[PDB]
């Protein structure tokens, strides 16, 4: 199971939310694997849809 921890996942989400504005689509982002793609995208959508705070994000 090559899955990141909570802190690594949150850091990846923050980096994605910083950098994804410079790419044509979410699939153009340099993903490490499919699990990272799904986790980061789902967290990003949930955060931007429900106005999650930092603790709620974690």
Q: Which residues bind to another protein, rule: CB under 8 A?
A: 14, 17, 19, 21-26, 38, 41-42, 44-45, 47-49, 51-54, 56-57
Is the Cβ of residue 3 or residue 52 nearer to another protein in the bound state?
A: 52
Is the Cβ of residue 5 or residue 53 nearer to another protein in the bound state?
A: 53
CA distance 4 to 2: 7
> Taking Cα atoms as reference points, which of 53, 1, 2, 8 lies closest to residue 40?
8
Residues 43, 13 contacting (CB under 8 angstroms): yes
Is the Cβ of residue 7 or residue 53 nearer to another protein in the bound state?
A: 53
């Amino acid at each position: 199971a090559g899955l990141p921890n909570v802190s690594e996942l949150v850091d990846m989400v923050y980096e994605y939310c910083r950098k994804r504005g410079l790419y044509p689509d979410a699939e153009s982002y340099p993903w490490k694997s499919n699990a990272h793609y799904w986790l980061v995208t789902n967290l990003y959508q949930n955060m931007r849809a429900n106005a999650l705070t930092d603790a709620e994000l974690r």
